[model samples]
Target: IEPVFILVRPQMGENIGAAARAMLNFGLGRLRIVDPRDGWPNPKAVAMASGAGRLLDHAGLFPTVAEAIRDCDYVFATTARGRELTKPVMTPERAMAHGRALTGEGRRVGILFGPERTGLENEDVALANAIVTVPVNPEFFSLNLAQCVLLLAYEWRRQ
Candidate 1:
């Protein structure tokens, strides 16, 4: 899969670093940061990223999410919150179905992640064609960004 991972207004270089690790574990390499809290490809992120530091180095920086996703064909956003847009919300399997079908059909598929603090803002969720919710128990829906990346990456690989 040639999907790219996009992080928007991410607050922590550590979580940014951890997300890189998760992406590497799942066979992805491309990363794009939409105005991170720290500088793009922060060194502390490299320290935390381990083998995935190369991704941190090569990560593209864009001032806004729209520019970050400009070249992608379809956008799957990861946010576990309520939204006014009735986006085609899906389980990992269903999202992967779309991913599997669309990848490399001459298109860039992207998985959007929000900042660690408040999750993807309401405006961020509005940008995607599909919204992915991991379906964790309602009481325990608060999975971290790295966990969410791992879940989808593995699911995408498995499916």
Candidate 2:
């Protein structure tokens, strides 16, 4: 089965819509949202989603990160910062490969994406089994929410 992408405490509707578009581009349809700031059925999200608006229509909403990932056997938290937690951090390529392997074993997988501004909190990261980090330029490591989703989704599609 394909891994579900969970947006944790997402702040912007535009970003959420863009993320959905990115996921659909790579043939990923499952989406879970955790307490979106602007609420669900956001008009901005619908406007931004364009052709991939169905993802928002079928998205699962959760109260917390823990609940969102409760059904997943394996979870990956995407973060740009290095946390104090001792979790296996993998590049998008390696993470997707591992995810594919896990799903091949009949495991349900999930990937967590944090809010657009702050990224994933340590507490949220702790809930995940691993971390997925992109190797962007250290001096300017500012990747938008949708961009990160696209990169990881692309990696999954490539594998």
Candidate 3:
């Protein structure tokens, strides 16, 4: 499966780097930066990536999340803040079920992560076919950039 990790306008370079590390751990390689605040290929990100620096170097940049998911056959947006998704809401388990089928068929798939502090905007999730929510404590379900990718990658790979 060509799992694409799309970071939407990330704030910190180190976080971007850390996210790269998480992607690498699950054998995911494609990294797309959608208008990052610190700019593309941020040096701190490369350093944080550790042994996964190659993945950072190969990262792609897009002007917006819409363009990022446009070419993919299946698109998923990950978020903790609940919103009315234009696409159907699915837990990570169900989302991965769809992911497995499409991935097995060698179809292109894009998984999205929004800004760390605010999560994805309404418009962003609308572009996707489904919303994938990571199960967490109802009171404290917050997650960092890398953790989001890690969880999705883990499940994506597991299936």
Model number with the top lDDT: 2
Please list the C-alpha lDDT of all candidates, in the order they appear.
Answer: 0.85, 0.93, 0.84
What's the TM for model 2? 0.97
**Model 2 weakest 10-residue run by lDDT:** 79-88
Clashing pairs in 3: none
Which window of ten consecutive residues has the lowest lDDT sum in model 1? 79-88
Best by TM-score: 2
Q: For candidate 3, give the lDDT.
A: 0.84
Over 1-159, each residue of candidate 3 has an lDDT whose tens digit, in order, gives 676888888899888888888888888899888988977667888788889999888888888888877778988889895567556878887888888889889998888998889988888888888888887798887689888888888887787
lDDT (Cα, tens digit) per residue for candidate 2, span 41-90: 79999899999999999999999999998899999999896565999999
lDDT of 1: 0.85
Clashes of 2: 0
Error of 1 at 62 (Å): 0.7
